């Protein structure tokens, strides 16, 4: 009931989670997810990112790292805890490690 998990990522990432049973339409026919394609621009990602951050029914957001870099300024601008944003490796992009939001919050972590 309480909170949904929003996903902003590539075609396979979103498809996988949707099969995972996560994601749904609100009463306004809005989807708590975005598929980011090669033709998707920065304003589209940022607008979606912001709407999830300002949407009180979301909370955890799952994004691809390569996207995290594309709109990275928005990831440090918001410092809260409901909107926990987790950065994941895309099907082909390589495993994340550096530029983790948390490793930045705490500079004492491997």
């Amino acid at each position: 009931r309480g909170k949904l998990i929003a996903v902003i990522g590539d075609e396979d990432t979103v498809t996988g989670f949707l099969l995972g049973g996560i994601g749904e339409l609100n009463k306004n026919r809005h989807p708590n997810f975005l598929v980011v394609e090669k033709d998707t621009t920065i304003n589209e990602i940022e607008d979606t990112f912001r709407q999830f951050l300002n949407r009180d029914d979301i909370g955890i957001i799952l994004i691809n790292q390569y996207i995290a870099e594309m709109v990275r300024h928005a990831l440090d601008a918001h410092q809260r805890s409901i909107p926990a944003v987790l950065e994941i490796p895309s099907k082909e992009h390589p495993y994340d490690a550096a530029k983790d939001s948390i490793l930045r919050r705490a500079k004492g972590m491997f």
Partner: peptide, 30 residues
């Protein structure tokens, strides 16, 4: 991610149907 590729190998292009055919969530967080 690999398992998805395996499903794709058999299925082909299911991703469009899954993305368009969305209504209610099975998983929610409290």
């Amino acid at each position: 991610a690999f398992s998805l590729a395996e499903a794709k190998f058999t299925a082909g292009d299911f991703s469009t149907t899954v993305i368009q055919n969305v209504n209610k969530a099975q998983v929610k967080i409290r």
